[model samples]
Target: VSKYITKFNVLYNSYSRDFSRFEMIRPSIQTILQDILSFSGLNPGRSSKRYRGFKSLLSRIIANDKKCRYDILYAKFIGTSKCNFANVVSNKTEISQVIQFVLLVLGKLLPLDAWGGVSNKKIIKDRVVDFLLLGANEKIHMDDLFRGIRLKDFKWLGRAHQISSKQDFELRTAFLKGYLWWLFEHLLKNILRSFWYITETSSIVSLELNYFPQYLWKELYESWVSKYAKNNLVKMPSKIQREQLPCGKIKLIPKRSSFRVICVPIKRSLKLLNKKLELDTLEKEKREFERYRKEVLSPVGQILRLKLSKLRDTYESYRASVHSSSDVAEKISDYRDSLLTRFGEIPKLFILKFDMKECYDRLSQPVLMKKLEELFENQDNKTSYYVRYYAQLDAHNLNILSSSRHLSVDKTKTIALQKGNILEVCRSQIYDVVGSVKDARGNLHLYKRKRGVFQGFSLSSIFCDILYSAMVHDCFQFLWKSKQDFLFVRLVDDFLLVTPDSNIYDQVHNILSGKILESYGAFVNKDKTVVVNQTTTKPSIDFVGLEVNTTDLSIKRNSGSISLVTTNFRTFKTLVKYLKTFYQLNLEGFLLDCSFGVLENVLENMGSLLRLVLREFKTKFTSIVKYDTFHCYKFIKFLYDISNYTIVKYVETNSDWDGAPELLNCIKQIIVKEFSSFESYSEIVEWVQTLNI
Candidate 1:
């Protein structure tokens, strides 16, 4: 069963299917019961039977083509050649029995919070009918099914998506075997089986889980799918000619509530071009837009990107330096380090943080473009930074749609004609980016933004920096011109103002509340804005996972807030890797400082961190994990890594690194106590002698 599940999970993801978009149900028997009612369109308000009259309303509402979505499903499970109302129900009796049967399956077999999945012909034998061919033959009907899928209101329990390491052994095991738990579960679980088709009268009825020579039903189902399932072979996803990336830019961000507000790019008409086609039209438009993005928009943005980078240094002048996701630790660490050295003057510190509500989506486009032009126009205009607007315009027109022009596939030849400055061109062309966002339940919503910026695009970030940088100079310049000690940082949409003056904190808090920036389109989300003052308990301020200690002039990690990563066991693997990455990053921060006992503090911190990782590992996989020796070995490797790779290379660069035989000794003490094995001690002592054992 697990082996079948492995095939289910692998095929679903490898082809990038959509059943994964199914709402990640915060599971419950209540939800499962509700799902059965919804699927059958059995309204509880209206008595289906009193004893039952529950009949499918879906038959009328769903077209035959749409109902065909579950053909193979109906064949193996409910014993149907065609999936219409009569097949699933005749008397109120059948619905009741099938309902009860599904109820038991949902309760006994399905896992709560279990992710949804699907199966493609790309299985053990990548054959067309290998999917139906006893799971093998004719070398498994050789012809890569090249198919994909999407479902809504849950055809294939629409996709909510996981996967992993030796600590990943469970994941490896998952990959090793069964249709993915859900695929096989669904392939057979909601499955009514041979019990339903024993007699002509019973062909319409449901039955108990049993084995009573159901071969008669198998004779019918097998012959039916043997012919029909061949056409059902899923085709590969569609792509633009000579294209590398099919679809990338439409950002995927989970809404506060799952499915309710998925911010993705999808279209209604895009759902099914040919449901029988291996892939759906949903994938077609995605590549269509991808072609549009790379061929049409990207080249233009490439010109604008170089243009945007020219303004990078200019933007940084007013407290807007650039940084990446991992670069945050260094930025925060260095700032606090630099600030503490000249700090003997102030007595109290206040840190004010504000997150601009809907910074990317709700940001005002007019204000954004105006600001970029303000900086680009350069004090006057005639001799400043700029791009040839007409040139971008021609490419939009004369650009040969080579692979697309008068050829096999041509999506959009580009019609956004414009006459204006570069910023105007950016406003007119760049941000007109349109795509789809995943809808709740399990589908896609066509999203065309008339405002804000596209979250992930070639030029979104640089342009985003310039927009916020302008506000720093124009709206909140007071924070910088202060006589009071302060640190103001604007990382894209989030702002952190660290200062020792109470009055200045008030000025910032008050100013941030105003629409001064919003006049240009930046609005402060007062609800998310936080004001932290040095107090007995509240001494540290958490800003985007980087906690700054007000009283101590230090920085720490707020593990809860910092975004680490995702995937099930895969999530754990990345968690450990991220822990290691951050550990090394912060370690280097302290290693750079030759402060008294810094080395001691560093070793002690590493030991504590080692224990933290071990604790987190145990906690994460507690239900399924074992205390494998690899777990301990991994711990030791992380411990040795610092001395060998980290400390060794640092000692070369910073001459002060060698004053520490003590460093090696402290690490040994941690190993000795943490691992009691005779071999553990032997390995530790050997590793401490030179770095790597």
Candidate 2:
């Protein structure tokens, strides 16, 4: 039945032909129509077999033309002829170009001489090519195609926008938004198969070779790019290009080698011509201006021309004299020496304090003026520091004749222009100098405006000096060996000292408050300071409203206790996430040691809670039985229940990271007597409730 149907179909179509040219005119018929049909509930029509039989007969007559290749003729006879479908997905305005593209593909597929068979064929492939090429200038709105896409799958297309800013920018491109997990599954298999067809070769080639219908080219190209699935044909970009590609400064080539051709690609040639046009326009505008400076504006500007030349000479002399004078490092070293000799009796534990907050904008105008007058008051009328300063204080009003020219943005070239000269701006603010308060540490830069069309200098300073100053406190630079010698720093305010004895603490606090703060203009926040003698236990003396919670050994915030301890695994995970977030910040080098130290404290405090629990359990339960077994068991059970409670809570709330198991095990070992515990477990509980950890 199949062989008879094949032969009869071929013979019947040998003479039958339909002359409908609608396919050639309809755009995106192959690409969009099929999808729309599926959306509109139309099945690909079951074409009557009699019509196919007639079509096949006509194909045979076309193959019999003198210029027809025997290879294609045989293909037609065997019913394997390439379907001559229109490229309906290509822009119709560029129908001539698309047809040219199709013919290009056809030329590759079939010999050109074969077209001669229809010597007077009205619809030669070349004419279709000519039509498309002629319409190349016709533009199609991409938004129209986007609207069509929205109709088919708005939900799928719009899902790209749902990600968080951090994840969207950082991870989405790296991870494929979890697609790898579902790719190759039955649902995506067909889609993947379709992707391989159109992207691997040009659509016209694909159509003529019976790969994909030509009309589907535009739809497939716009939405889904063909990735060379595990095939080495597609070269992935280098790390540098990938990093820079998103910024759009430089073109990142997926196939870098493809762009290395010696011949200039037509696309790039056009871009080169555009750039040349822009440069030409700039030159023309420059020539037309009469008052434009022939030299670099910075060197020739009115104010900088004379004033800066003198300032440069003075600056060089000052720079040399400043470097040649008494060394700054020697002064710092001598000061430290004087402190050590004066406070020799004080123990090292009390001396880890520092000062902060230095303001550097109080230098008097008289002081700077006297210094400058001594240096360059001898210069000429135009270039002297005196004229520049005087002129800067008044509005800089310029005289412009009718022939005057001004710099302006070229209307034709829209990229970017350096509209204002930097030196000119500096000239206006030359008199705008600021002095920092004595012994303070920061500075500001000044600038001028309006070119003294009227001349006055307005000085401002947002410049930072702390970042450049290498004078960090010695304590921060050096690591402390003794935890007792460590001090808690409260920026620009309070300082807490953890020392072995009262004497050392007292000596350190005095030097820090009297000498350091007085020298630096920062006063110590005394009322807020506290001294802790040991790593464990509540302090013997407390500041106003400060009570030492000997039980928890943590700082008391106010009324209720903020334990910061996890009884169950869920809370433990919250702590871990917090720790991880902390560590990630450290990796970024932000807040460095400050945040790192907090994590250490959190771990130390948690361990202290567990250790103290074990200590009390052993002390209390030992007398009950052969040992502190029952009481110890109960204490261990409580700790385990805390962990168990955490896991149960997380399970109740459906938490993702369950971390209770190890904590429970730690409690189990204590119950089994892996470590000795303190006596009086109940007393410990009573203490824990009184103080918060």
Best by lDDT: 1
Evaluate model 2: give its TM-score.
0.19
Q: List ranges where model 1 is wrong by over 4 Å.
A: 1-262, 266-288, 295-308, 315-347, 374-463, 478-484, 501-507, 532-537, 560-604, 612-640, 645-661, 673-685, 689-693
User: How do the residues 1-693 of candidate 2 rate in per-residue lDDT, one tens digit apiece?
Assistant: 011000111110011112221111122324332333333233435762212322332243334322334233323332232322233222111222223334433343333222223431233443333222211122122211121111111112123535546533333232221212111121122221222122111221121211232223223222222221121112232222212111101111112112100111111121122234564645554353211222232122333334334443543211111121122222222333343355543232322323332122111222223332333346543442222122344226643332536631322211111224332333322322111110111111111111111111112121111111111132223322232333332211222344335655655555655643343224444544444444433333332222322222223212221222221112222433433332222121111111112334332333444454444333433422332124334443344445444334333422233333443444344334524244434443432333211
Worst 10 residues of 1 by lDDT: 135-144
Compute each candidate's TM-score over C-alphas: 0.50, 0.19
lDDT value, candidate 2, whole model? 0.27
lDDT of 1 by residue, 409-480 (tens): 544433332223345546643454444322223233233445566554545666666667666775666654
lDDT of each: 0.43, 0.27
lDDT for residue 382 in candidate 1, whole number 0-100: 39
